[PDB]
Design an enzyme around this catalytic site. Structure first.
Site, PDB file in Angstrom:
ATOM      1  N   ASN A  44      -4.365   7.482  66.385  1.00  8.96           N
ATOM      2  CA  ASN A  44      -5.379   6.547  65.919  1.00  8.96           C
ATOM      3  C   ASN A  44      -4.853   5.245  65.369  1.00  8.96           C
ATOM      4  O   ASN A  44      -5.423   4.193  65.668  1.00  8.96           O
ATOM      5  CB  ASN A  44      -6.345   7.228  64.912  1.00  8.96           C
ATOM      6  CG  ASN A  44      -7.611   6.398  64.704  1.00  8.96           C
ATOM      7  OD1 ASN A  44      -7.643   5.454  63.909  1.00  8.96           O
ATOM      8  ND2 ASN A  44      -8.674   6.708  65.465  1.00  8.96           N
ATOM      9  N   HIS A  81     -18.214  -0.971  62.221  1.00  7.45           N
ATOM     10  CA  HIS A  81     -18.930  -0.120  63.125  1.00  7.45           C
ATOM     11  C   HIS A  81     -20.428  -0.008  62.884  1.00  7.45           C
ATOM     12  O   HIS A  81     -21.109   0.770  63.514  1.00  7.45           O
ATOM     13  CB  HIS A  81     -18.316   1.266  63.184  1.00  7.45           C
ATOM     14  CG  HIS A  81     -16.861   1.269  63.626  1.00  7.45           C
ATOM     15  ND1 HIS A  81     -16.101   2.393  63.466  1.00  7.45           N
ATOM     16  CD2 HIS A  81     -16.121   0.289  64.157  1.00  7.45           C
ATOM     17  CE1 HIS A  81     -14.901   2.049  63.909  1.00  7.45           C
ATOM     18  NE2 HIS A  81     -14.879   0.798  64.338  1.00  7.45           N
ATOM     19  N   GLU A 104     -14.421   3.093  71.877  1.00  4.71           N
ATOM     20  CA  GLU A 104     -15.587   3.893  72.105  1.00  4.71           C
ATOM     21  C   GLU A 104     -16.406   3.423  73.259  1.00  4.71           C
ATOM     22  O   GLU A 104     -17.518   3.923  73.497  1.00  4.71           O
ATOM     23  CB  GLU A 104     -16.344   4.076  70.810  1.00  4.71           C
ATOM     24  CG  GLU A 104     -15.502   4.805  69.758  1.00  4.71           C
ATOM     25  CD  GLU A 104     -16.168   5.138  68.473  1.00  4.71           C
ATOM     26  OE1 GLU A 104     -15.746   4.640  67.391  1.00  4.71           O
ATOM     27  OE2 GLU A 104     -17.184   5.860  68.488  1.00  4.71           O
ATOM     28  N   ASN A 119      -5.562   8.735  59.439  1.00  4.60           N
ATOM     29  CA  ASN A 119      -6.250   7.568  59.983  1.00  4.60           C
ATOM     30  C   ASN A 119      -5.398   6.336  59.797  1.00  4.60           C
ATOM     31  O   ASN A 119      -4.378   6.144  60.488  1.00  4.60           O
ATOM     32  CB  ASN A 119      -7.669   7.515  59.480  1.00  4.60           C
ATOM     33  CG  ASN A 119      -8.552   6.643  60.339  1.00  4.60           C
ATOM     34  OD1 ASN A 119      -8.017   5.805  61.069  1.00  4.60           O
ATOM     35  ND2 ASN A 119      -9.847   6.843  60.286  1.00  4.60           N
TER      36      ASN A 119
HETATM   37 CA    CA Z   1      -8.584   3.919  62.434  1.00  6.51          CA
END
Ligand code: CA
Ligand code: CA
EC number: 3.8.2.2
Length: 314
Positions: A120, A287, A37, A175
């Site tokens: 991902n 995160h 990110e 994911n």
């Molecule tokens: Ca992931």
């Protein structure tokens, strides 16, 4: 409870890594993280980092871009026969990254000639086939999209013979992913997280790029925004799953269903995890703080593909 919760000591490893993801050890025991990110001028500029475990210092080894389109590198596996990383990238698909920081993009298109989707996470089986989640839409240069709202996420298997085979579709943000093996080493079950739906899905692995028997295998607690992100097996085939938004890592027994145990984290957004080889130590990315931690689990991890031997005997 029941569900029993444990509260191990979390030790800080490193800090300030946007979207800290894809923790992985290479065959030398070096440790890497991805920073999907990171942005520059509002456009992707994600990074692949080596972390010095003694100091917490970070080095950016690769900032991948193809034709000016920056990557969103999000998940990793180490290869076995060469010390190179396979990296799932939400803009660029599947990358192979060397320790010197050079990289190659593996597929613009799948084996049926469909445009590749952004990826991902990934998991090697012991046969060397790489199972990959693809929650983004088409790779760059297509406009970026992701399946958090709508069911267009896919699953791939990148095979030993070099085929990028789409093996399922229509997930809402596939994911984490993991492969269960028989004690003899044979791959036999694939587990896939579907983040917002609070599900883990299973398939029987019948062979390379051959999955069947799709089932809702596990249920992720909570109605927070988020859900299962990354996962890995311990050496007893318990599945540890980061439940992003819940402050916990869930522990599923071999048969799935509901978690048998939860691990409270000192942060809300665990994202991904990885064992250090030959140890009980789990490295966890998160995160809330965009940071990496470690804690001690009850037992060692299940060996990754890179810890197995091509020319082994037993
Ligand atoms: Ca992931
Ligand atoms: Ca992992």
């Amino acid at each position: 409870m029941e569900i029993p919760v444990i509260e191990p000591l979390f030790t800080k490893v490193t800090e300030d890594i946007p979207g800290a993801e894809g923790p992985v050890f290479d065959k030398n025991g070096d440790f890497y993280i991805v920073a999907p990110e990171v942005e520059v001028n509002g456009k992707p500029a994600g990074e692949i980092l080596r972390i010095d475990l003694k100091t917490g210092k970070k080095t950016v080894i690769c900032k991948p871009e193809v034709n000016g389109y920056g990557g969103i590198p999000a998940g990793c596996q180490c290869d076995r026969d060469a010390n190179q990383l396979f990296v799932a990238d939400m803009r660029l698909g599947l990358l192979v990254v060397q320790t010197d920081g050079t990289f190659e993009e593996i597929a613009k298109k799948d084996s049926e000639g469909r445009r590749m989707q952004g990826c991902n996470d990934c998991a090697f089986d012991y046969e060397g086939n790489l199972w990959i989640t693809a929650p983004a839409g088409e790779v760059a240069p297509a406009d970026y999209t992701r399946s958090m709202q709508e069911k267009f996420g896919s699953i791939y298997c990148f095979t030993t013979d070099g085929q990028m085979i789409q093996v399922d579709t229509a997930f809402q943000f596939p994911n984490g992913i993991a492969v269960r093996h028989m004690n003899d080493g044979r791959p036999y079950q694939l587990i896939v997280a579907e983040t917002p739906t609070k599900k883990l899905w299973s398939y029987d692995i019948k062979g390379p790029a051959k999955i069947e028997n799709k089932k809702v295998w596990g249920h992720i607690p909570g109605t927070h925004e988020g859900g299962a992100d990354g996962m890995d097996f311990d050496e007893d085939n318990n599945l540890l799953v980061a439940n992003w938004g819940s402050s916990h890592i869930e522990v599923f027994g071999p048969d799935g269903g509901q978690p048998k145990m939860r691990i409270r984290c000192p942060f809300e957004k665990p994202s991904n995890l990885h064992f250090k080889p030959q140890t009980k130590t789990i490295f966890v990315t998160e995160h809330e703080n965009n940071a990496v931690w470690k804690f001690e689990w009850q037992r060692n991890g299940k060996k990754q593909y890179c810890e197995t031997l091509k020319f082994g005997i037993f």
